[PDB]
């Protein structure tokens, strides 16, 4: 059916799903889980950032036999950040299963230490392509019991520099391995890989788009000189759990952040003219609730964020959509100078939406 209980998972795994607060299957979960449970390969078109993990980790965990100390399932991802995210979700979902071991290994984890780690039981490996192939070829990661492999964001896994690495990985695995493949896009390389390796895959085309539905949108006619005063008013009236305040330049981000800080606001800031590692650190602290508001440029999923402020109104309708759209939040407020008035109506039309005058 369409309830988690319908999939007849182990009670331990369902308890894991319950404790995640996952009440009803998402559409990608509804489409992926019963087919993957049967053993069929999957070919899925889903956007990046879509909650694919929640779909494929469940049948992966259901497939495990914890009476065996062997690696039995692998998830291959193109970035260190996705590896961390997926392994965390996997560790939480499986926390009732009694002895299930999940390990993440990337170019960003220490190779010596990871090798020592693989001396002990590991059932599930989450990894970047380069690191896991290196580990398999060194004999450290033994993969003759792997019965399932997931490829997440397969287009990035199968780009020019990586296609052979992925091919080599696949050739070390039991020929009958179940494959679950997820991708936003389907270049020739992914098409080739598909044809060679996937076996009559179940096809899923679940492309959730960014939408404005459910987002209340307002604008306020303001001069540039008045913008912080207007911000003062907003943050003295709304209930803000967390907010994101977008500006159109790195210079404006810093100046604003430093200004409102001096005025007693809680904020971090992030923009283009910073080291990436610094950027990641700040964003991670914002997510963990160490400030209330993030001031930033366009660089982009944080549940606590209930208000987005466009302190500078964007030039492009697509930028606007990325700033306040959601896949499937609360309030968006636009500060509009005279010179923004054209883009306001234009972006409104392009996106087929409504941005109402703010209530007094």
């Amino acid at each position: 059916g369409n309830e988690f209980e319908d999939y007849c998972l182990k009670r331990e795994l369902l308890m894991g799903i319950f404790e995640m607060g996952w009440e009803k299957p998402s559409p990608i979960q509804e489409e992926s889980i019963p087919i993957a449970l049967s053993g069929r390969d999957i070919l899925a078109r889903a956007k990046n950032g879509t909650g694919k993990s929640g779909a494929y980790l469940i049948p992966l965990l259901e497939r495990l036999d914890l009476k065996k100390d062997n690696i039995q399932a692998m998830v291959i991802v193109p970035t260190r950040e996705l590896a961390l995210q997926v392994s965390q979700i996997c560790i939480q979902v499986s926390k009732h299963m009694g002895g299930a071991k999940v390990m993440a290994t990337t170019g960003g984890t220490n190779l010596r230490d990871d090798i020592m780690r693989l001396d002990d039981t590991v059932h599930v490996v989450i990894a970047t392509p380069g690191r896991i192939l290196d580990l398999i070829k060194k004999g450290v990661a033994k993969v003759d019991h792997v019965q399932m492999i997931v490829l997440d964001e397969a287009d990035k896994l199968l780009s020019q520099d990586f296609v052979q690495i992925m091919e080599d990985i696949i050739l070390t695995l039991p020929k009958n391995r179940q494959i679950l493949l997820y991708s936003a896009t389907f270049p020739l390389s992914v098409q080739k890989f598909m044809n060679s390796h996937l076996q009559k895959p179940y096809e899923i085309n679940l492309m959730e788009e960014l939408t404005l539905k459910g987002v209340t949108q307002y604008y306020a006619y303001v001069t540039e000189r008045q913008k912080v005063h207007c911000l003062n008013t907003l943050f003295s009236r709304l209930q803000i759990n967390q907010s994101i305040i977008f500006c159109n330049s790195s210079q404006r981000v810093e100046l604003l952040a430093k200004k409102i800080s001096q005025l007693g606001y809680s904020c971090f800031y992030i923009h283009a003219k910073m080291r990436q590692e610094h950027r990641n650190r700040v964003f991670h602290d914002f997510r963990n609730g160490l400030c209330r508001n993030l001031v930033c440029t366009d660089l982009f999923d944080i549940q606590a964020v209930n208000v987005v402020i466009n302190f500078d109104f964007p030039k492009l309708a697509e930028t606007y959509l990325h700033r306040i759209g959601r896949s499937g939040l609360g309030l968006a407020i636009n500060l509009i100078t005279y010179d923004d008035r054209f883009n306001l109506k234009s972006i409104e039309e392009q996106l087929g939406t409504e941005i109402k005058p703010i209530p007094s």
Binding site: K47, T79, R80, A83, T106, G107, G108, T128, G130, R131, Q160, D161, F162, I165, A184, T185, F186, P187, L188, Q191, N205, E209, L210, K315, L316, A317, E318, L321, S346, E349, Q350
Partner: protein
């Protein structure tokens, strides 16, 4: 030998999610209408198609229009575009747009070694059409539908044969930006794409006819190619380091 061969698109369709095929006679009336469409009878042909084609045959009509007409009849792109404007059916418009994207990607992701002679043209034509029914009508080309800038970066990496297909395609799409109140220079979306083309243009070994494409496009967009601001997006990307995650 055949300038209008669309077999590449037809074979790809025989593997798309099969749709509702109208009866042969409704199929025949649709062909008649599009064969005989002109500026002088457009309003009547719109009423004709409405009184003839049931709603469930709409997907097939968008497929017929895009694959079999628009792909090989660039001289009537304005006509078919104006037909969309007269029909005023937003759902049909999205089917047409989706089908446009679908056929474009079929050609972009085809193995060029096995391409038909006509495929370069089919892609240029569909590109020209895409710009006309999006940018020229002040509607964005969303990166989640087609990532034009990335397409150029990716083609650069694959080589000259890929660039031979991709660069004229991008030029045809961008021609409509100059007729767009929203997307004409200096719109940031248009300019980012133009700055990547300028970078391409700087490549000493980029084929001359591709340098020509970019320079003609510049003139059509009233841009001084020397005032563009190419960066290092082509180089850049430490591909060796990136192998380590």
């Amino acid at each position: 030998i055949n300038t209008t061969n669309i077999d590449t698109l037809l074979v790809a369709t025989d593997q798309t999610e099969r749709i509702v095929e109208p009866p042969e006679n409704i199929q025949e009336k649709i062909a008649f209408i599009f064969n005989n469409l002109s500026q002088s009878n457009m309003t009547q042909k719109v009423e004709e198609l409405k009184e003839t084609v049931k709603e469930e045959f709409m997907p097939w009509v968008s497929q017929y229009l895009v694959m079999k007409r628009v792909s090989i009849e660039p001289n009537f792109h304005s006509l078919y575009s104006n037909f969309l404007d007269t029909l005023k059916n937003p759902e049909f418009n999205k089917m047409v747009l989706n089908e446009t994207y679908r056929n474009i990607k079929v050609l972009l992701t085809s193995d060029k070694a096995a391409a038909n002679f006509s495929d370069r043209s089919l892609l240029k034509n569909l590109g020209h059409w895409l710009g006309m029914i999006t940018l020229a009508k002040n509607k964005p080309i969303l990166h989640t539908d087609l990532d034009v800038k990335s397409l150029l970066l990716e083609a650069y990496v694959k080589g000259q044969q890929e660039l031979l297909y991709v660069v004229p395609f991008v030029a045809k799409v961008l021609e409509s930006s100059i007729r767009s109140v929203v997307f004409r220079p200096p719109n940031p979306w248009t300019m980012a794409i133009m700055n990547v083309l300028a970078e391409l243009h700087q490549e000493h070994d980029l084929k001359l006819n591709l340098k020509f494409e970019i320079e003609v496009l510049c003139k059509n967009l009233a841009l001084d190619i020397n005032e563009l601001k190419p960066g290092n997006l082509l180089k850049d990307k430490d591909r060796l380091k990136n192998l380590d995650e």
